[PDB]
């Protein structure tokens, strides 16, 4: 392996709030770390420590206390919340000099929580004059209406995903001021297209509130939901 | 000639007795002339040979604040041990470090340490192919195979062969003039009564740096050896050391014998006769 | 232990040379590094010269010299390749063992087509009558899309795109109105071809 | 574990009653490092004592230097009084004046 | 300089 593990992986949470992301490890390096990446200032220390017991400030430690309480594992806390903490975290270990950073973790800070909104997924069918003029199509999809922008969109032709053909954006470009939209790719030959035998899905996870999490009046609780927006191929004439 | 860049670093727990000490104390030809201690007025790294001087501000704080770092460090390594070892916590324990590199008069690397000693005891060292590692009991092991599988030999190779040598040459450069400097030896022989009409007279060498120094009586002309008596060289106090050997001899033939001072500082070897 | 990336934003076309300018503040020779951040990612390690030679030989036509002269650890290339676009991140780590970033370089890699063919069209939500959207597809990168400055109307910048296709390198912007009557031709204001929604006679 | 200290007392110059000299006490190759060392005039434990920060040798000895500033008379005497985890007694030795 | 250990 050779790597740092690092969940829970996307969290959302309003102020005053208190978690708990941990990290384990399965390289017995002593050190370990809690950087912040912002656009902005790149990354940024807040806690590290040699091993068992160990836990000494780095450059951004207010709001923040790490715990070492075994070699393996590290984790960051946050007692009160707030959103200027909002961000992307990763723990790191690095035996000397060589460090190992984990996957990562997304916290935003809301202040108030019904503020959030799952997405609203949509397959828009190719033009057929695509098809005409280059012989291949272009599914292309777009969603709408999310806040927490923590969502993970991927393609999936009858019943397996693919990675090619596909050009799903960077980041969630915020559509207003409460909401963003991710619209990608994926383009076949018009082949493909033109065969009902074929399936195509576009799906977007999108990482709500928890279960265990106080949602308020009857309306549909936001919690961590797969939306998907399918479409047929069709033959032409 | 050779010359060598050590680094005698030292912590000892203090069960009880507040957060353990910690020493970093460098040597240039086993010449002290940088060190931090844990437990003075402030620690951290202060000039002990006069020479330092030529170090500017930032050197300090940099070193100091690597002190500082390696401090904890080792304050874990001793929780550590304890581990490995299944110790009580209760009494106290020691550890000491030997960091140094050797390089000769053409600048080539002569030879590249790096020893971990407990409680007065070889725990683990870096073998001369600067690459592998040598344990000494269980404990060692599981910090050998964990040491290792973090690319620890290479860096610490860099160090030795590449860092710790920019500054080896560069104190030097700053303090040649004291260094190999040169004391002369002087010495002077004393006639010692004993019972059966036998006598000692012992060769004393006084008031002379470097401290490396050999001397003999001689059976006016054999090796008067299997039979003497030497004290370790003894520090003077003013930078200067000392050191006598001797042994019993018949009167009437005191004078028949021989004492011989080596000491690099002596145009030629001495020779005392009573 | 101070580091800083000159340059936020690099652009390039794709098999050329690479210059990511580092720069540091240290009064010794404090340990450099350099880490490459991808979509979603986690920084990796392409580089680290601990001391030594001043050039160190990374990993895919990676390498940087220190220089002491100049305090720089400056991660070059000769012909960066489309896979590569991406943040890389300098990094120091001297006091202690923590690394020290600077804000990082984001290089972008233009890919070609010996064929450009800047097409224009719409497609529509077939579970959403009147859902307009306008697709700018097969275009020379060497040209910016038009962006815009009216709410209810956003456009992804150009996101490349290639398929199992041997020159398949393609491109996307997505342009989207809710502006009652509006032709993708008048937000693609000035570009070329813009293919009828109306379906070719059967 | 635990090596016996060495001692050695000594004057750093060349005795001579009436001229004020200083007196060393070289302890070494002990350990742990903590450990007691009393220089004193008489029997009576002497004030004003210097010490020598602590070092070690390559086999992992302490060694450390105590000297008083002081002026010896053919009557009087001094010795070095050590303590140390290992010997059971503390241990005590006295200048031999030509050593 | 002297060197920056590592773990035990």
Redesign the interface.
């Known amino acids: 392996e050779a790597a740092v593990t690092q969940s829970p992986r996307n969290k959302v949470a309003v102020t005053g709030g208190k978690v708990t992301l941990s990290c384990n490890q399965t390289n017995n390096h002593?050190?370990m770390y809690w950087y912040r990446q912002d656009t902005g200032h790149g990354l940024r220390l807040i806690h590290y420590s040699?091993?068992a017991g160990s836990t000494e400030k780095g450059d951004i430690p207010d709001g923040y206390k790490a715990s070492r309480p075994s070699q393996e594992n590290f984790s960051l806390i946050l007692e009160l919340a707030t959103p200027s903490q909002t961000s992307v975290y990763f723990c790191a270990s690095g035996?000397?000099g060589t460090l190992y950073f984990g996957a990562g973790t997304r916290l935003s800070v809301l202040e108030d929580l019904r503020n959030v909104t799952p997405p609203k997924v949509s397959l828009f069918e190719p033009s057929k004059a695509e098809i005409a003029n280059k012989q291949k199509a272009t599914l292309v999809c777009l969603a709408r209406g999310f806040f927490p922008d923590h969502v993970e969109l991927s393609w999936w032709v009858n019943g397996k995903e693919v990675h090619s053909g596909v050009s799903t954006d960077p980041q969630a470009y915020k559509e207003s001021n409460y909401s963003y939209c991710l619209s990608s790719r994926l383009r076949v030959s018009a082949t493909f297209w033109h065969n009902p035998r074929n399936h195509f899905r576009c799906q977007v996870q999108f990482h709500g509130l928890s279960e265990e999490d106080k949602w308020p009046e009857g309306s549909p609780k936001p919690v961590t939901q797969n939306i998907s927006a399918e479409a047929w191929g069709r033959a032409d004439c | 000639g050779p010359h060598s860049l050590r680094?005698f670093?030292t912590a000892v727990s203090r069960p009880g007795l507040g957060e353990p000490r910690y020493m970093?104390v460098?040597y240039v030809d086993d010449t002290e002339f940088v060190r931090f201690d844990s437990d003075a007025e402030n620690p951290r790294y202060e000039p002990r040979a006069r020479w330092m001087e030529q170090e500017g501000p930032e050197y300090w704080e940099?070193?100091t604040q690597?002190a500082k770092?390696?401090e904890q460090?080792?304050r874990?390594?001793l929780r550590?041990?304890l581990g490995?070892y299944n110790q009580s916590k209760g009494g106290s324990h020691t550890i000491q470090?030997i960091?140094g590199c050797e390089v000769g008069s053409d600048g080539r690397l002569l030879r590249g340490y790096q020893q971990?000693a407990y409680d007065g005891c070889d725990?683990?060292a870096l073998n001369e192919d600067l690459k592998t590692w040598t344990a000494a009991d269980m404990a060692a092991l599981i910090?050998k195979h964990?040491?290792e599988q973090?690319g620890?030999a290479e860096?610490?190779r860099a160090?030795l062969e590449g860092?710790?040598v920019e500054?080896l040459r560069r104190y030097l450069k700053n303090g040649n003039a004291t260094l190999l400097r040169t004391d002369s030896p002087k010495a002077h022989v004393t006639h010692h009564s004993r019972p059966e009409d036998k006598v000692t007279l012992r060769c004393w060498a006084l008031g002379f740096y470097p401290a490396d120094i050999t001397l003999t009586w001689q059976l006016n002309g054999e090796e008067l050896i299997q039979d003497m008596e030497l004290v370790e060289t003894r520090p003077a106090g003013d930078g200067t050391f000392q050191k006598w050997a001797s042994v019993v001899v018949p009167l009437g033939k005191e004078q028949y014998y021989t004492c011989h001072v080596y000491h690099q500082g002596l145009p030629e070897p001495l020779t005392l006769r009573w | 232990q101070s580091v800083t990336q000159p340059d936020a934003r690099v652009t390039v076309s794709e098999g050329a040379s690479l210059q990511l300018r580092c720069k540091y503040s240290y009064s010794?020779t404090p340990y450099l590094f350099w880490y490459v951040q991808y979509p979603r990612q986690g920084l990796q390690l392409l580089l680290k010269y601990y001391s030594g030679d001043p050039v160190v030989q990374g990993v895919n036509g990676f390498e940087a010299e220190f220089s002491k002269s100049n305090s720089s650890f400056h991660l070059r290339k000769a012909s960066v390749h489309w896979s590569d676009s991406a943040v890389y991140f300098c990094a120091v780590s001297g006091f202690?063992?923590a690394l020290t970033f600077g804000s990082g370089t984001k290089v972008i890699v233009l890919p070609y087509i010996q064929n450009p063919e800047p097409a224009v069209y719409a497609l529509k939500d077939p579970r959403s009558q009147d859902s307009t959207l306008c697709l700018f597809t097969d275009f020379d990168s060497q040209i910016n899309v038009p962006k815009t400055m009216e709410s209810g109307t956003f456009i992804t910048d150009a996101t490349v795109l290639d398929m199992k296709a041997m020159d398949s390198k393609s491109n996307g912007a997505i342009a989207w109105s809710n502006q009652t009557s509006f032709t993708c031709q008048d937000i693609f204001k000035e570009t070329n071809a813009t293919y009828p929604s109306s379906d070719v006679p059967c | 574990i635990q090596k016996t200290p060495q001692i050695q007392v000594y004057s750093r110059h060349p005795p001579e009653n009436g001229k004020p000299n200083i007196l060393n006490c070289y302890v070494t190759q002990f350990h742990p490092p903590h450990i007691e060392i009393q220089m004193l005039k008489n029997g009576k434990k002497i004030p004003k004592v210097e010490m020598s920060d602590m070092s070690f040798s390559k086999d992992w000895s302490f060694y450390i230097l105590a000297h008083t500033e002081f002026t010896p008379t053919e009557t009087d005497t001094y010795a070095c009084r050590v303590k140390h985890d290992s010997m059971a007694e503390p241990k005590t030795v006295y200048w031999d004046r030509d050593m | 300089?002297?060197?920056?250990?590592?773990?035990?």
């Open positions: 002593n050190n040699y091993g035996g000397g | 680094y670093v970093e460098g940099r070193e690597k770092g390696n460090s080792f874990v390594d550590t041990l490995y470090v960091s971990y725990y683990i910090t964990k040491w973090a620890e860096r610490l160090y860092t710790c500054w | 010794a202690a063992s | 300089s002297i060197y920056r250990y590592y773990g035990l």
